[PDB]
């Protein structure tokens, strides 16, 4: 059934699984028309499909042209997400396909189940975890490739850079979720933390800075402080 705290380690076993987050598929700016009505302008988005064990993010970029002439776009977006995930699985060799796909929003279950009826053996699951994957567009390099896109495109990123050479996937996932949670709670503060030291660079090909093990501890602690911080500032504690 659903994925939660009790069965957290399942994400790092050796059954190939993917998380799908659809929260950045359909994105709009809302603006005033000349007549003073409100209208939306869609901007490019992406599907966030992540193998948590290996770090691979199959980022499918959703170009705004896919919404042209379509109605009910928030509902279409969940079905478009499902169609692209289905296409991805089908593109992959049988031995590389998800044994499970975990959707971060329950509204994706029926769209995905319906698009994956050809794959009765892939479990489509929800999760009770509040995962921060919506903050993926606060990763500069991911945001750039989405906004620059002029056509549908899929770009694979390792979201863990080279961390798995030094830490486990459990730990790399925990780092990733703390970074994203921080970025989601205060993007300016979070980014300041990540980049305050110009000597630690992001190697062109990676998403995050080349922190040493001890620098990550520091970074991770500061991200915690931030999330505690904004929590007070939010609730006054």
Partner 1 sequence: MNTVPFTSAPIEVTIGIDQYSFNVKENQPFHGIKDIPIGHVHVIHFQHADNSSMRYGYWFDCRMGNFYIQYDPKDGLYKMMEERDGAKFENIVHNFKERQMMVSYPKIDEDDTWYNLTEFVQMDKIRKIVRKDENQFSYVDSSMTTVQENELSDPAHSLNYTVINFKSREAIRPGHEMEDFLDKSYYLNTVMLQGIFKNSSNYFGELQFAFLNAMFFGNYGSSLQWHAMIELICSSATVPKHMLDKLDEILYYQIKTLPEQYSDILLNERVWNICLYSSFQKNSLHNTEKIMENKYPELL
Binding region for ligand VJY (CB under 6 A): 16, 18, 51, 56, 92, 96, 98, 156
Q: How far is the CB of 120 from ligand VJY (least distance, A)?
A: 17
C-beta atoms surrounding 232 within 10 Å? 9
Q: How far is the CB of 75 from partner 1 (least distance, A)?
A: 8
Q: Is 16 exposed, middle or buried (0-12, 13-18, 19+ CB in 10 A)?
A: middle
Determine the residue with CB nearest ligand VJY.
51
DSSP state of 28: E
Is residue 115 within 8 A of residue 82, CB to CB? The reply is yes
Binding-site partner at residue 16 among partner 1, ligand VJY, none, CB < 5 to 8 Å by type: ligand VJY
* Residue with smaller CB distance to partner 1, 71 or 130: 71
Binding-site partner at residue 42 among ligand VJY, partner 1, none, CB < 5 to 8 Å by type: none
Q: How far is the CB of 54 from ligand VJY (least distance, A)?
A: 6
Query: If DSSP codes are grouped into helix, strand and coil, which group holds residue 128?
Result: coil
* Residue with smaller CB distance to ligand VJY, 16 or 200: 16
* Residue with smaller CB distance to ligand VJY, 96 or 110: 96
* Residue with smaller CB distance to partner 1, 119 or 208: 119
* Residue with smaller CB distance to ligand VJY, 74 or 91: 91
Q: How far is the CB of 98 from ligand VJY (least distance, A)?
A: 5
Nearest to 89 by CA among 49, 125, 53: 49
Residue ranges in contact with partner 1 by CB under 8 A: 75-76, 79, 82-83, 110-111, 113-115, 117-118
Binding-site partner at residue 144 among ligand VJY, partner 1, none, CB < 5 to 8 Å by type: none
Residues 6+ apart with CB under 8 A from 44: 27, 61, 62, 63, 64, 146, 147, 149
* Residue with smaller CB distance to ligand VJY, 58 or 208: 58
Is residue 23 within 8 A of residue 54, CB to CB? The reply is no
Residue 31 phi, psi dihedral angles, 5° rounding? -145, 165
DSSP state of 108: G
Name beta bridge partners: 154. Answer: 60
């Amino acid at each position: 059934g659903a994925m939660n705290s009790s069965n957290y380690a399942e994400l790092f076993n050796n059954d190939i699984k993917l998380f799908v987050d659809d929260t950045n598929v359909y994105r709009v700016t809302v603006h005033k028309t000349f007549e003073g009505n409100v209208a939306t302008k869609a901007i490019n988005g992406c599907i966030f499909t992540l193998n948590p064990k290996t770090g691979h993010l199959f980022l499918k970029i959703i170009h705004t042209s896919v919404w042209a002439g379509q109605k009910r776009l928030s509902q279409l977006a969940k079905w478009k997400t499902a169609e692209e995930v289905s296409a991805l699985v089908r593109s992959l060799p049988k031995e590389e396909q998800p044994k499970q796909i975990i959707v971060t929003r329950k509204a994706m279950l029926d769209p995905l189940e319906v698009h994956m009826l050809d794959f009765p053996n892939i479990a489509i699951r929800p999760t009770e975890l509040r995962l921060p994957f919506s903050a993926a567009m606060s990763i500069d390099k991911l945001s750039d490739v989405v906004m620059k896109a002029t056509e549908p495109q899929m770009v694979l990123f390792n979201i863990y850079d080279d961390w798995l050479d030094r830490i486990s996937s459990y730990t790399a996932f925990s780092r990733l979720t703390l970074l994203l949670r921080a970025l989601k709670t205060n993007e300016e503060s979070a980014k300041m933390i990540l980049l305050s030291d110009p000597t630690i660079t992001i190697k062109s090909y990676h998403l995050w800075p080349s922190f040493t093990d001890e620098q990550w501890i520091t970074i991770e602690s500061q991200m915690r402080d931030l999330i505690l911080t904004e929590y007070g500032r939010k609730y006054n504690v």
